[PDB]
Amino acid sequence: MDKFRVQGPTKLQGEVTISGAKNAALPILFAALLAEEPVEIQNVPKLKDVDTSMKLLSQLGAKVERXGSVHIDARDVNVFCAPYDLVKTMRASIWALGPLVARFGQGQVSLPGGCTIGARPVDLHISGLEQLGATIKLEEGYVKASVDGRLKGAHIVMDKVSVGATVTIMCAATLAEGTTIIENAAREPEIVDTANFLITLGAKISGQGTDRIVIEGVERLGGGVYRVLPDRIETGTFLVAAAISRGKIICRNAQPDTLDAVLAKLRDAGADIEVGEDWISLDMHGKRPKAVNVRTAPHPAFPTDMQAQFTLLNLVAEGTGFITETVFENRFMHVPELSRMGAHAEIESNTVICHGVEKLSGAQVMATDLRASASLVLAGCIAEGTTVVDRIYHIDRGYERIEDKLRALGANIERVKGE
Numbered sequence: 001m002d003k004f005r006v007q008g009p010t011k012l013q014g015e016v017t018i019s020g021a022k023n024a025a026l027p028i029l030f031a032a033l034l035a036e037e038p039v040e041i042q043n044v045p046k047l048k049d050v051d052t053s054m055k056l057l058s059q060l061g062a063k064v065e066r067x068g069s070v071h072i073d074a075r076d077v078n079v080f081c082a083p084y085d086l087v088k089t090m091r092a093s094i095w096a097l098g099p100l101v102a103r104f105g106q107g108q109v110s111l112p113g114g115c116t117i118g119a120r121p122v123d124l125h126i127s128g129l130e131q132l133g134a135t136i137k138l139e140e141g142y143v144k145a146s147v148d149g150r151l152k153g154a155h156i157v158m159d160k161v162s163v164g165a166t167v168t169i170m171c172a173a174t175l176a177e178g179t180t181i182i183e184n185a186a187r188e189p190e191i192v193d194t195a196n197f198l199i200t201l202g203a204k205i206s207g208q209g210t211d212r213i214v215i216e217g218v219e220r221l222g223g224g225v226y227r228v229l230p231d232r233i234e235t236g237t238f239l240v241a242a243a244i245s246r247g248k249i250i251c252r253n254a255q256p257d258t259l260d261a262v263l264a265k266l267r268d269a270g271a272d273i274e275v276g277e278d279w280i281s282l283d284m285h286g287k288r289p290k291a292v293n294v295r296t297a298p299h300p301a302f303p304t305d306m307q308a309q310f311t312l313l314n315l316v317a318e319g320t321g322f323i324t325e326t327v328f329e330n331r332f333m334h335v336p337e338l339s340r341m342g343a344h345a346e347i348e349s350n351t352v353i354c355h356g357v358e359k360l361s362g363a364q365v366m367a368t369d370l371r372a373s374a375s376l377v378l379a380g381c382i383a384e385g386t387t388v389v390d391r392i393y394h395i396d397r398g399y400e401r402i403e404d405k406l407r408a409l410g411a412n413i414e415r416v417k418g419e
């Protein structure tokens with residue numbers, strides 16, 4: 001079991017180049033199952049989930065390869081049951097279902113894996129596909145969908161906002177007969193990116209980025225070339241790294257408009273932030289950040305994917321701040337671990353009350369999920385002494401070369417293989 005051994009304290013400062021969004025690359029890779037011509041996807045991060053997705057697509061019969069850019073030729077896909085081992089290791093696998101039923105009339109996928117930060121049901125994906133005409137049966141952990149002929153467009157009012165289900169419905173709708181209107185659609189930047197990728201292939205979609213997406217189905221999608229947008233969560237993670245470090249960082253290959261809420265909160269924490277067309281700089285001017293109150297919610301509000309990181313920020317900030325997590329019900333797994341490092345926090349229902357301390361102490365901590373793992377590594381960088389983060393495999397799912405990137409900022413980190 002690989003771990004990260006981190007020696008602190010170290011001030012993280014310098015520059016970092018942001019990789020493509022984990023969460024845009026993934027839905028785009030699965031959306032490629034709809035493509036009847038080859039596609040080249042550029043700026044795809046080298047992440048465990050991307051590798052898993054490529055193997056999954058290959059096992060469905062698509063020709064897949066990469067390198068910098070990922071190439072997919074799904075013309076001859078001929079297997080419609082996603083392999084269990086690949087499906088259970090990440091959340092993104094659920095996205096193989098919609099394209100398979102929309103293009104081939106059938107698809108079978110086991111319930112997905114991914115961070116265990118909640119029960120994470122897929123009822124909205126199922127309900128959406130059923131509204132488009134699919135028949136779905138759940139048996140022995142597999143979601144089995146089928147339709148005789150094409151799906152048919154429908155006016156779907158999502159009764160809960162969901163990033164993943166919005167993607168499932170939007171992608172499947174592109175091959176349906178007629179027009180689909182998705183109400184209460186998730187507005188995340190990755191939904192916009194996925195929609196634009198689909199449009200590149202010939203899909204007819206509008207409203208992406210708003211609560212109402214309209215899709216006019218077409219007979220078939222072609223191919224194309226598309227570059228994935230920057231990872232806003234990786235960007236926020238490194239901005240937080242600089243903030244808690246009382247340092248400065250410039251993030252290159254960034255997309256500032258995907259982070260309005262996060263940047264505003266960092267300014268509230270005392271950060272001096274500037275933005276360019278494709279970069280973001282943060283400078284603490286050597287000052288300890290000020291605690292902030294945060295409430296997570298769907299985009300454009302503060303993202304749940306930055307919650308663990310801001311929990312860390314508050315725990316070393318001046319004063320008391322709270323973070324209310326409204327999106328997932330089991331996303332405070334990092335709190336007990338940070339407490340092992342000297343943090344002062346109390347959990348009250350869906351809110352963590354943080355009381356910042358001057359400095360954390362190194363300790364043996366356990367990564368419990370993706371964003372928690374990144375938060376513990378950052379904690380290790382600023383803590384006094386040695387920190388060992390166990391089960392760091394979690395970090396490889398969403399951060400490309402975080403070890404190298406942190407080292408370039410001044411971190412003393414070593415990946416230790418086998419205890």
Ligand SMILES: CC(=O)N[C@H]1[C@@H](OP(=O)(O)OP(=O)(O)OC[C@H]2O[C@@H](n3ccc(=O)[nH]c3=O)[C@H](O)[C@@H]2O)O[C@H](CO)[C@@H](O)[C@@H]1O
Nearest residue numbers: 023091092120121122123124125162163164165305327328
């Ligand atoms: C691979 C990927 O893109 N992952 C991101 C995506 O996941 P994901 O797509 O799973 O996020 P969702 O938006 O769907 O989940 C949000 C909330 O809706 C619930 N829900 C979701 C689907 C469903 O069918 N029924 C249901 O009840 C969830 O369990 C959760 O309580 O968005 C999340 C929220 O911004 C991020 O934190 C994840 O990193």
